[PDB]
Amino acid sequence: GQVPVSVNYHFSRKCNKECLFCFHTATTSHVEKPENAKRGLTLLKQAGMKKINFAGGEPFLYPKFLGEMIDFCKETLQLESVSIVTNGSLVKEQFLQKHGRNIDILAVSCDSFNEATNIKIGRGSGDNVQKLYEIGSWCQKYDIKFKLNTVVNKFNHLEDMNDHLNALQPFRWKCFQVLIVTGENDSDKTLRNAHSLTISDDEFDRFCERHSSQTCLVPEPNRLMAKSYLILDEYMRFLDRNGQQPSKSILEVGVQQALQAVFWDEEAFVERGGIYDWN
Ligand SMILES: Nc1ccn([C@@H]2O[C@H](COP(=O)(O)OP(=O)(O)OP(=O)(O)O)[C@@H](O)[C@H]2O)c(=O)n1
Ligand SMILES: C[S@@+](CC[C@H](N)C(=O)[O-])C[C@H]1O[C@@H](n2cnc3c(N)ncnc32)[C@H](O)[C@@H]1O
Ligand code: SF4
């Protein structure tokens, strides 16, 4: 069986924002009890997990749970890399002061540095860029690696972000071609429809070209993003991200049997840079 070296745990689906492309929508409000999440994280560690990314959903809607899991994953499990990805709006300095020793990487999602763009996308009410710079400075202060995630879409594919990126200096800048996920953002029956925001291969490439002097840039065209992640849902089942049913929960059948039920393109994972110096 595959070794689940780097795992995204979408532990909640609730979110405070309305990004028009969102591919992990608010279809439930279930979250595992802390004791059960810690058991699941323990099984993943024992199966060879090195890196955990907390996602959703917006993680900072659940700071008590998130802090508990981050402290556990570093202090108890001794994971090599504990990461979070957040829209940044609800992050407070106090959280990084309290839990910063246990956070390896903090990724903030900001798709543009024109505040009109972030508002039209539906992520922001006009303070995302300001908040991003603030979080950048806190990571500096609390010894956290600072990472930026950008979705390249119809509304921002012509933008030039170089001066900002030169000011921010994240160690890692993920540039995702907006991705369609069956059952999440692919019709008018779903909570989103991203079809009107999708871009050509050539548009995505010209964006990456515009930013070719950024050595932190990590591009992810649809080909490399689609099946290259290990994704646990709010019940700690692995998701196939293609319309297939989830696995059974790792808490019910164990990691090996759960992972067997999904496809994970390990060739894609390596090629996109999934293994890196993540502490
Ligand atoms: N088909 C896919 C592919 C990816 N994702 C999600 O998209 C996000 C991408 O965020 P990123 O910061 O790239 O995740 P990490 O795993 O932290 O990336 P890396 O280790 O490469 O820095 C993750 O939450 C992942 O689970 C998804 O929901 N569906
Ligand atoms: C679902 S969000 C969860 C964490 C948090 N709410 C945030 O937005 O950072 C995880 C990452 O996927 C990105 N993402 C969301 N929808 C996407 C899509 N359709 N295609 C590509 N990336 C997308 C987000 O911008 C973010 O960087
Ligand atoms: S991508 Fe936007 S809508 Fe989706 S979970 Fe993150 S902030 Fe919320």
Report whether 8 belongs to an annotated binding site: yes
183 is written with which tokens?
């059952």
CA distance 79 to 75: 8
Judge if the beta carbon of residue 185 lies within 6 A of ligand 3. no
CA-angle at 175, arms to 20 and 69, nearest 5°: 80
What percent of the chain is helix, strand and coil (3-state, nearest 5)? 35, 15, 45
Resolution to 1 decimal place, in Å = 1.7
* Angle subtended by helix axes 63-71 and 34-46, to nearest 10: 30
Q: Which positions are annotated as active-site residues? A: 15, 19, 22
The amino acid present at 232, given as its one-letter code, is L
Give the three-state DSSP class for 231: strand
| Rounded (10°) CA dihedral 3, 253, 278, 173 | 100
Q: Please give the distance of CA 90 from its chain centroid, rounded to a whole number.
A: 16
With CA atoms as reference, report the closest residue to 17 among 173, 103, 131: 131
Q: How far apart are CA 249 and CA 67, in angstroms?
A: 23
**Residue 116 corresponds to which tokens in the numbers above?**
């009109």
Q: Which residues line the pocket of ligand 1, CB cutoff 6 A?
A: 6, 8, 23-24, 53, 55, 83, 85, 107, 149, 172, 174, 179, 181, 225-226, 229, 231, 241, 274
Pick the CATH number of 6-271 from 3.30.300.30, 3.20.20.70, 1.10.760.10, 3.40.50.10470: 3.20.20.70
What does each C-alpha distance from 271 to 6, 43, 228 come to in angstroms?
14, 27, 9
Is 109 labeled as ligand-binding? yes
Which atom belonging to ligand 2 lies closest to the Cα atom of 56?
Answer: 3
Closest C-alpha among 95, 96, 99, 128 to residue 112: 128
Q: What is the DSSP string of 130-198?
A: HHHHHHHHHHHHHT-EEEEEEEE-TTTTT---HHHHHHH--SEEEEEEP---TTTSBSSSSS-B-GGG-
The minimum-distance atom of ligand 2 relative to the CA of 185 is 19
103 assigned to a ligand binding site: yes
| Cβ atoms of 121 and 51 closer than 8 Å | no
234 neighbors 11 (Cβ within 8 angstroms) = yes
Structure token digits, residue 135: 């979080």
Nearest ligand, CA 216: 1
Strands, sheet with 6-10, edge to edge from the N-terminal-most edge strand = 217-220, 172-177, 145-152, 105-109, 81-86, 51-55, 6-10, 230-232
82 neighbors 37 (Cβ within 8 angstroms): no
Q: Whose CA is nearest to atom 26 of ligand 2?
A: 109
Q: Is 241 annotated as a binding residue?
A: yes
Residue 168 CA to ligand 2 center (angstroms) comes to 20
Ligand 3 pocket mutation pick from 29, 84, 87 by most atoms within 8 angstroms of CB: 87
- One-letter amino acid at 66 equals L
222-247: b (≥16 Cβ within 10 Å) or e: eebbbbbbbbbbbbbbbbbbeeeebb
- Other beta carbons within 10 Å of 36: 14
**Interrupted after residues, the chain (C–N over 2.5 Å):** none
Domain ranges of the chain: 6-271
State how far the Cα of 49 lies from the Cα of 41, in Å rounded to an integer. 9
Closest CA to 4 of 278, 276, 275, 210: 275
